[PDB]
Amino acid sequence: DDKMNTAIKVIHTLKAAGFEAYIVGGAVRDLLLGKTPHDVDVASSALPQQVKVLFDRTVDTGIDHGTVLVLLDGEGIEVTTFRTESVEFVLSLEEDLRRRDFTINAMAMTEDLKIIDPFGGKEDLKNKVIRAVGDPDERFEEDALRMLRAIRFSGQLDFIIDMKTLLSIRRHARLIRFIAVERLKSEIDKIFVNPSMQKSMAYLKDSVLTRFLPVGGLFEVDWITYHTDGNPTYGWLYLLHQQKRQFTDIKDYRFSNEEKRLIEKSLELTALNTWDQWTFYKYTLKQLEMASRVTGKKKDLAAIKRQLPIQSRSELAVDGWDLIEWSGAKSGPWLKVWIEKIERLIVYGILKNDKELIKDWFEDEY
């Protein structure tokens, strides 16, 4: 909510030092849409080291590519010198704008609230059209990821893709093999939490991106019954569950072990025909929700889990060292089997979680 104000102050400081500076890109777009911009980028004729000399607090991880992060009034504004893409500095705003991906992202706004729109982004915004700047063939060779971003933007903004731009995506779909899979997963995660995501998936198939994306034919499922819960991971669980496949078929996208576990465990639960106390004890609440969300089942999972006698093995009143004592046997892999027998009986409320009571039980069964 304060990023715009801070960006205006960054612009005043740069212009007072004799440089040009504008707000560019998604903030201008969001503003004209009535949204609040989540990020605000400033483009300037200042080179990085001159920006660094006008502001006390600054972060430099992007200097090589022409970007300095300015820290001012608790907000961070990226200041980027006029550039292209292998990064080359240019001397005018228009040379910088004419190499951005789509017309709605190639506008600039002056401090005095004047829009600079050399490529028609105002009109395409009014008409809900995602259109490449200039020749769509050049744009897509410069960065093939822009093909997937056009798909993601269409579902984010509920826009259509310009026809000439879409046909260009079809010709160049195979260049998607060169994109780092992490950048592919980033944009696919963004599609999974979009509103109007069913439109993004339609475009993904019709642009012939499902032919060349990693294991891309798997995205061609029925997305009608899918509603995002805000977590992109649920998109992957839904994809797998609809086609009866395992986590291993989507391994190429390089999931974190957290994501991997959440998908695998939730898939496990959809294989289970009935859930009892042991199920509610052994799986986490987040896994239970995601599995029931994709199976249509609608229970109050949080209340069932809250009424199990225990919640985790750490509350068990006995460890394998008690069993080693009471049995008179030597530590071995057999301990893990008996701890689970005791765990089951405590979770099903048959045995009391009490060291002296578990002891009487164990002495009889052994």
Domain with residue 348: its CATH number is: 1.10.246.80
* Residue list, annotated binding site: 29, 100-101, 105, 143, 146, 149, 152, 156
Find, among 289, 280, 242, 281, the residue nearest to 262 by Cα.
289
Whether residue 174 sits in one domain with residue 238: no
* Tokens, residue 351: 């045995």
Whether residue 248 sits in one domain with residue 237: yes
* Tokens, residue 230: 């805000």
Whether residue 203 sits in one domain with residue 244: no
CA separation for the pair 36, 75 (Å, rounded): 15
Domain of residue 322, residue span = 310-366
| Exposure string over 126-147, b if 16+ CB within 10 A, otherwise e | eeebbbbbeebeebbeeebbbb
* Tokens, residue 274: 């009935």
End residue of a domain, out of 133, 166, 199: 133
End residue of a domain, out of 181, 210, 226: 226
CA separation for the pair 89, 50 (Å, rounded): 14
Whether residue 248 sits in one domain with residue 266: yes
Whether residue 96 sits in one domain with residue 17: yes
Query: Which residue shows structure tokens 């889990």?
Result: 305
Whether residue 157 sits in one domain with residue 125: no
**Exposed/middle/buried for 293, CB within 10 Å: 0-12, 13-18, 19+?**
middle
Number of domains making up the chain:
4
CA separation for the pair 76, 300 (Å, rounded): 42
* Tokens, residue 277: 């106390």
Q: By what technique were these coordinates determined?
A: X-ray
How close are the terminal C-alpha atoms of the chain, in Å?
68
For residue 96, give the CATH number of its domain.
3.30.460.10
* Residue list, annotated binding site for CTP: 29, 100-101, 105, 143, 146, 149, 152, 156
Residue 41 is inside which H or E element, if any? strand 41-44
Backbone CA torsion sign across 214, 220, 226, 228: positive
Whether residue 193 sits in one domain with residue 303: no
Give the pairing of strands 160-161 and 129-130: parallel
Whether residue 289 sits in one domain with residue 236: yes
Resolution in A: 2.5
Whether residue 318 sits in one domain with residue 220: no
Query: Which residue shows structure tokens 């915004």?
Result: 125
Q: Are 121 and 162 in contact (CB under 8 A)?
A: no
Whether residue 106 sits in one domain with residue 29: yes
Give the pairing of strands 129-130 and 57-59: unpaired
Whether residue 296 sits in one domain with residue 193: no
Whether residue 196 sits in one domain with residue 96: no
Backbone CA torsion sign across 323, 329, 331, 334: negative
> Distance of CA 305 to CAs 262, 277, 280, 341, Å?
18, 8, 6, 20
End residue of a domain, out of 309, 334, 358: 309
